[PDB]
Amino acid sequence: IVGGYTCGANTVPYQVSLNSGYHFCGGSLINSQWVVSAAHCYKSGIQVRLGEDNINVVEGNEQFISASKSIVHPSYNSNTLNNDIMLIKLKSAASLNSRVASISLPTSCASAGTQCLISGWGNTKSSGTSYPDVLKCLKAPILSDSSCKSAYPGQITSNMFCAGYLEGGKDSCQGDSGGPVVCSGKLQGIVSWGSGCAQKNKPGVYTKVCNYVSWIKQTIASN
Ligand SMILES: *C(=O)c1ccc(NC(=N)N)cc1
Ligand SMILES: [Ca+2]
C-alpha cells in the first residue's frame, strides 16, 4: 500500500497473509474454513496466516493453517486477468474471535463513489521498494466504470472495477494482491492489478466479487 496508514494490530480481522516460506499475497477469510484471494496468487504449498500484524514477529494472536485445496476460478485468464479469483480451503477451521473474523460476501454490487478499505503488506513505494512488516490500510473510493475504462482502454471487463485516485499517490501495490477491498462491511473487491503503483491516471483494478457470490457459495457447499 502506497500512501496509506498503519492499520493497527488486528483491526482488519479478516485479512490473511498467504505464506510459502514468505509472505506473497493477501487474502480474505470468508468463513472459518475458506479464504478468497486472487487466482494470480495461486501456487502449491500455501500456509494461511490469520491474526497477523507484524508478519516477521510472533505477537500472540496468530493462527497458521495449511491449505488443503485451492480452486482457481474456472474461467480465469492469466493474460487478461479476467476472473482473477480463487478459493483456498484450510485443513482445519480457524478459531474465530475478535481478532480473527470472517468478512461477509456482498448481497449487492457496490457503486462508484462508495468508500472502501484496502489493506495489505505490499510495497509502500511508487518508485523503488520498501516492504512493511505491519499491515497497511488505505481508504479509497470506487471509480466510475467510465473513468476506469478511460484509464485502461481495452482492458476492463465486467468483472473488474477501479478504485483509488486518478491523481496517483495512494494505491495498492505488489504484495497486496489477493487481499481485500471492503465497503460497508462487505468484501466487494480483491486486489488484482494495475500499471505500476500510485501512478497518475493508473488506479488499482480490483476483481468484482459480487459477480462471484453464486460460484463461491456453490463451490463451498460441495468441497
Ligand atoms: C498485486 O500485487 C497488485 C495489484 C495492483 C497493483 N497496481 C496498482 N494498484 N496500481 C500492483 C500489484
Ligand atoms: Ca506475527
CATH number of the domain bearing residue 47? 2.40.10.10
Whether 22 and 37 share a structural domain: yes
Whether 141 and 196 share a structural domain: yes
Residue that has been written with the C-alpha cell 511508487 in this structure? 126
Whether 182 and 204 share a structural domain: yes
* 136: its cell numbers: 497497511
Whether 116 and 26 share a structural domain: no
Nearest ligand for residue 151 CA: 1
Return the closest-CA partner of residue 209 out of 83, 88, 114. Answer: 83
- Length of the chain in residues, anyone? 223
Residue that has been written with the C-alpha cell 480457524 in this structure? 94
Nearest ligand for residue 125 CA: 1
Asked if 52 and 72 touch (Cβ cutoff 8 Å), the reply is no
Asked if 150 and 131 touch (Cβ cutoff 8 Å), the reply is no
**Residue 69, CA distances (Å) to 43, 72, 100, 130, 135 in order:** 11, 10, 21, 32, 26
Whether 26 and 107 share a structural domain: no
Nearest ligand 1 atom to alpha carbon 191: 4
Catalytic residue at 40?
Answer: yes
Going by the annotation, the residues of the binding site for substrate are: 171-172, 174-175, 177
Q: Which residues of 105-123 are buried (b: 16+ CB within 10 A; e: fewer)?
A: bbeebbeeeeebbbbbbbb
Domain that holds residue 180: 1-12+103-210
Cβ neighbors of 144 (< 8 A, separation 6 or more) are 112
Whether 82 and 120 share a structural domain: no
Return the closest-CA partner of residue 136 out of 171, 183, 86. Answer: 171
Whether 108 and 206 share a structural domain: yes
Distance of CA 62 to the CA centre of its chain: 19
Whether 76 and 173 share a structural domain: no
First to last CA, the chain: 33
Count of structural domains, the chain = 2
